[PDB]
Amino acid sequence: QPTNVGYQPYRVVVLSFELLHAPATVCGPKKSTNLVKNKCVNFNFNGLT
């Protein structure tokens, strides 16, 4: 109750994140672009960089 900080309700969320052998799944807001083969490219795929 608000009658109680010490004994008052606090919401908790734990977000836990996975890097399995699978393709990635839960993705950021970033924008994709063209696949420039046979040149020295800096790259991100899916955070793998």
Binding site: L20, H21, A22, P23
Partner: peptide
């Protein structure tokens, strides 16, 4: 009713193209 299993029951542990390799 019984047998020797022989070399059976393996399964892919992960989705990686490792190739031409002995890997533990």
């Amino acid at each position: 009713a019984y047998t020797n299993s022989f070399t059976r029951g393996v399964y892919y542990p992960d989705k990686v193209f490792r190739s031409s390799v002995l890997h533990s």
